[PDB]
């Protein structure tokens, strides 16, 4: 009854003691002697225009030249970023697209949003006519993020406080990861794609695994909703960016926050987090319309991107670190290098 | 090589025709949000002007994240059932929609639903309106208020008091960026007239004529 909540309180108190027992130094304390990072001048190389409403998600191909971008007009444009040429423009059934994904093979593209269905599109179908390969229904709220593991598996976070591992060839939920008490706003697959982290509106992140299905770890520390989450490129850390206007670096084995990228003048929440190839730059889109580039170790903002006329909804760095595309609510994708 | 770039550029050209043709359809339609399987588009067309309203059903009761998708709708349709106090439950939701950062340019068309229900409530002796709003006990129906017939001054009291609550939230902030249009539930003509009025005020604001 009520004393069961007391025993859970003592258990999480034991967790708090076991996590401050393994904390005697910081990430900032070890990094007082490392080299700084200069003012990161990134000029907008390409400006992909061609979306009619606010771009809510973009995603890079794994060859790092094709990027899909979903906007709220109902359109899913695959761009060649090297030439600013549109490769495809898939019209979508529902116009409210809160997420997009590109398959790592490059054949499929997911989308999803307030329609509660993940639509999987084949790009290389027979000769090129982008039709819907699979509509994955089974979620009870809006889809917030979707990330392909294989061509055959996807994982979709939803606003029904639940992530879900699907099977594209069959169309049904292989695994259902429950445990969040708020809308799961994002997810990020590991470089090994065995685990994935998922932050929600209850200010908590959770580390899962697609094999078993139970929650491996839980990360508190944020004050409000986690709008964005991304993995450090080794799979051992991840940066969460929330609506309390902080980013935080949580490590899995350390099981707690290593660094907190905040500022006094910064008051609005981080819409998107992304890392560089080295993990030395944590780029973070904002609702003050500019992506600050945080030195991940030193926690002082190296650069600012600052080209967007509206809220930087989406922000994605390439696989090879060669460029960084920021889409925004002004319907323009900017490629920074 | 140069030939595949030519093929890619002709594909870009044939995609830009469809995006040009889709911009014409997208700028013509008015997106609404009915805020009385996870979304129910209902396209309707009055006076050849295309609307498509979005009734967000099969969503959770926690709206602080999917309401930002609807920051670029022309209007939020806010159907409030004038009777847990579920009138203050809509007063507070209007208070948070009005003062939200992204819906701060998005106007609200406010439908004060169920006025016949309120009439048979207030004349029968089930006046909870004085118990849940004691500021109604000192209220006086304004001189710029129409008691259209079938109305004694006990239902046009509570009715205009309830829109005065919402216009007390609405006129605190948001002077020129967005507007609340209160109505008492022909119902589609009011949405059309107020969307014409939203679009006109947006255009008059883009010229600094308002």
């Amino acid at each position, epitope marked *: 009854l009520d004393q069961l*909540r007391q025993e859970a309180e003592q258990l*999480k108190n034991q967790i708090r003691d076991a996590r401050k027992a393994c904390a005697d130094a910081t990430l900032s304390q070890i990094t007082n002697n490392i080299d700084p990072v200069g003012r990161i001048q990134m000029r907008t190389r390409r400006t992909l225009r061609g979306h009619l409403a606010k771009i809510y998600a973009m995603h890079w191909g794994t060859d790092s030249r094709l990027l899909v971008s979903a906007s709220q007009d109902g359109k899913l444009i695959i761009w060649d970023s090297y030439t600013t040429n549109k490769v495809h423009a898939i019209p979508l059934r529902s116009s409210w697209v809160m997420t997009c994904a590109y398959a790592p093979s490059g054949n499929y593209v997911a989308c999803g949003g307030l329609d509660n269905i993940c639509s999987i599109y084949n790009l290389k179908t027979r000769e090129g006519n982008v039709r819907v390969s699979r509509e994955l229904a089974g979620h009870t709220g809006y889809l917030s993020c979707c990330r392909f593991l294989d061509d055959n598996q996807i994982v979709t976070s939803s606003g029904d*406080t639940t992530c879900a591992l699907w099977d594209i060839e069959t169309g049904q939920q292989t695994t259902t990861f429950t445990g969040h*008490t*708020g809308d799961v706003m994002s997810l990020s697959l590991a470089p090994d794609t065995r685990l994935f982290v998922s932050g929600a*509106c*209850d*200010a*908590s992140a959770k580390l899962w695994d697609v094999r078993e299905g139970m929650c491996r770890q839980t990360f*508190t*520390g944020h*004050e*409000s*909703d986690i709008n964005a989450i991304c993995f450090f490129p080794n799979g051992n850390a991840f940066a969460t960016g929330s*609506d*309390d*206007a902080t980013c935080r670096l949580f490590d899995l084995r350390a099981d707690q926050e290593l660094m907190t990228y905040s500022h006094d003048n910064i*008051i*609005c*929440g981080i819409t998107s987090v992304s890392f560089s190839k080295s993990g030395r730059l944590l780029l973070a889109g904002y609702d003050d319309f500019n992506c600050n580039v945080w030195d991940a170790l030193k926690a002082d903002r190296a650069g600012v991107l600052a080209g967007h006329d509206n809220r930087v909804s989406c922000l994605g760095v390439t696989d090879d670190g060669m460029a960084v595309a920021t889409g925004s609510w002004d319907s323009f994708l900017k490629i920074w290098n | 090589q140069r030939n595949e770039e030519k093929a890619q550029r002709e594909a870009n050209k044939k995609i830009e025709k469809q995006l040009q043709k889709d911009k014409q359809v997208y700028r013509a339609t008015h997106r609404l949000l009915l805020l009385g399987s996870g979304i129910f588009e209902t396209k309707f067309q009055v006076d050849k002007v295309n609307f498509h309203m979005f009734d967000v059903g099969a969503q*959770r*009761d*926690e*709206r*602080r994240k999917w*309401i930002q998708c609807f920051n670029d709708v022309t209007a939020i349709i806010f159907v409030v059932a004038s009777s*847990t*106090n579920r009138l*203050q*439950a809509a007063l*507070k939701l209007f*208070d*948070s*929609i*009005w*003062n*939200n*950062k992204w819906l701060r340019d998005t106007s609200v068309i406010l439908f004060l639903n169920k006025q016949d229900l309120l009439a048979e409530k207030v004349l029968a002796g089930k006046s909870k309106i004085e*118990d*849940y*709003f*004691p*500021e109604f006990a000192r209220y006086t129906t304004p001189e710029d208020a129409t008691p259209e017939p079938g109305e004694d001054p006990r239902v046009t009291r509570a009715k205009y008091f309830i829109r005065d609550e919402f216009l007390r939230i609405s006129t605190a*902030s948001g002077d020129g960026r967005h507007y609340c249009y209160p109505h008492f539930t022909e119902n589609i003509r009011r949405v059309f007239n107020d969307c014409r009025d939203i679009i006109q005020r947006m255009h008059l604001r883009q010229y600094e004529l308002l």
Partner: nanobody, 126 residues
């Protein structure tokens, strides 16, 4: 972890007084608009009274207007609901909520069924 620890709720006859307090840890208390959400025995979640970051923007339901008086003390990370002249329609579980974002005039989903930043609630019984 955002922790809302309500306290001070007991039993009293109609016309009495109680002083609720929600001890709030895990977040900077001054940046958030707080709230008081009561839940009746027979109904859902009724908002009662909010107070903004400073403590000068105070609103109430009319069911508690003139009778209850909230105040926050930002230094001790506390939020009070002084209760006076209680009615049998005021017996409820009083959750002390906290709108999610900082520095925002909007206050969403506070009375929702599964809101995150809401406490466990003092049962106030008359």
């Amino acid at each position: 972890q955002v922790q809302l620890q309500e306290s001070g709720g007991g039993l009293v006859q109609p016309g009495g007084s109680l002083r609720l307090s929600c001890a709030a840890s895990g977040f900077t208390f001054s940046n958030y608009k707080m709230n008081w959400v009561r839940q009746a025995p027979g109904k859902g979640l009724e908002w009662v009274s909010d107070i903004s970051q400073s403590g000068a923007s105070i609103s109430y339901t009319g069911s508690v207007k003139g009778r209850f008086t909230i105040s926050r003390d930002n230094a001790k990370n506390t939020l009070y609901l002084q209760m006076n002249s209680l009615k049998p329609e005021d017996t409820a579980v009083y959750y002390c909520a906290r709108c999610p974002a900082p520095f925002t005039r909007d206050c969403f989903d506070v009375t929702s069924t599964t809101y995150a930043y809401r406490g466990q609630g003092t049962q106030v019984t008359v």
